[PDB]
Amino acid sequence: HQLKLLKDDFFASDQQAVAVADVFAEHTHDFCELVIVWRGNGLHVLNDRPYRITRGDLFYIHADDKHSYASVNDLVLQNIIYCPERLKLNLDWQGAIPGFNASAGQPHWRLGSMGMAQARQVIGQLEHESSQHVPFANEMAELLFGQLVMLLNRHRYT
Amino acid sequence: LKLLKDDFFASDQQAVAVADVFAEHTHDFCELVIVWRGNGLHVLNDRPYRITRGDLFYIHADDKHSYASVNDLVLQNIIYCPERLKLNLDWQGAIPGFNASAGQPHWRLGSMGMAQARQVIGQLEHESSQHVPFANEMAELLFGQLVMLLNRHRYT
Ligand SMILES: C[C@@H]1O[C@H](O)[C@H](O)[C@H](O)[C@H]1O
Ligand SMILES: C[C@@H]1O[C@H](O)[C@H](O)[C@H](O)[C@H]1O
Ligand code: NI
Ligand code: NI
C-alpha cells in the first residue's frame, strides 16, 4: 500500500507555500521538499537507492519521489517542505531547485560550513514565521524561502 | 547638491545598498534612515526633527534633507531605486515615500523591531558584492524582509 503525505495535513493553510517540518516510513507526497542533514549519520533511501547520509548532505525531493530515512547514529535532519504551485515570488524557482517539477536528475548535494551557517540562520527565522495569525507571515516566509533557495544554489556542490 | 545613484550604488544592477555634518541635499534615489544610537538633528523639507535611537524615516528622492550629530549620532541609510527593484513584491504598499514624499515620514521602533532590523541590515550589508552569485537577488530578498519587518514593528 502507498503512503502519500498530503499538503492538507502538513501546511497551516491553503495559502501557506512553505513550512519547516522539524526514522520515517517509506512515503511519497503531493508537495516537494528540501532536506538538510545537521549532524549525526544515517541512511536515506530515495527511489530505491540507498544514501549513507551525514552532516552537510542536501537532498532535493520532488513530490513523486518515494523515500525513507533511518538514523544510524544521532541523526538530525530538517525538511523544508513547499508547494511549487503556491509560490508567488518571481524567482526562477525551477532554475534554482532540482526536483521542482519532476524528480531531480541530481538529488544529492553537499554544503560547506558557510552554506550550513547561512542556511541555519534563514531556517531559524523561517521557523518563527509559521503563524497564520500574524499579518503577512506567509509573505515573509516566502521571502525567507527565497533566500534559502538562493543560498543553497550559491553554496551547494556535488 | 543632489546625490546620484551612479555614485552610491555598486553597479547599474544593484537596486538597494547600505550607504557608507551631512549637508543639505536631494537625491535621484529613495532611502530609509534608521538611527541606532546617540542623538542629533534631522531637517527634512525644512522641518527639524530631534532624532535618537529608534527613529525611522522614510525618504523619497525629491525630499531635501540634512543631518547634524549632537552626540555621537549613529545612523544608517538603506538606499534604494524603485525603478530597479525586480522582485514582484508590493513595494509601494510596504514603503512610505516610495512614489513621493511620505505623508508620515517619521516612525519609531521598539527594542525588538530594532534588533530584527539590525540583523537583516547586517545581512544586507554582506550582500553588496557584485561578484558573488545571486548577491543582487539576495539583496532584494533581504530588503523585502527588512521592509516587511519595519512594517510589522513601526509605530508613530
Ligand atoms: C513532510 C514530511 O516531514 C518529515 O520531516 C519527513 O522528513 C518527510 O520526508 C517529509 O515528507
Ligand atoms: C545616500 C546618502 O548618504 C548618506 O547616508 C546620507 O545619510 C544621505 O542622507 C543619503 O542620501
Ligand atoms: Ni518526504
Ligand atoms: Ni539623503
Curated annotation (Swiss-Prot), chain B:
GO biological process, one term: positive regulation of DNA-templated transcription
Location of this chain's protein in the cell: Cytoplasm
Keywords: Activator, Cytoplasm, DNA-binding, Repeat, Rhamnose metabolism, Transcription, Transcription regulation
Transmembrane segments: none
Domain of life per record: Bacteria
GO molecular function: DNA-binding transcription factor activity; sequence-specific DNA binding
A Gene Ontology cellular-component term: cytoplasm
Subunit composition and interactions: Binds DNA as a dimer.
Function: Activates expression of the rhaSR operon in response to L-rhamnose.
Protein's recorded name: HTH-type transcriptional activator RhaR
Organism the protein comes from: Escherichia coli (strain K12 / MC4100 / BW2952)
Interval of the full protein contained in this chain: 5 to 165 of 282
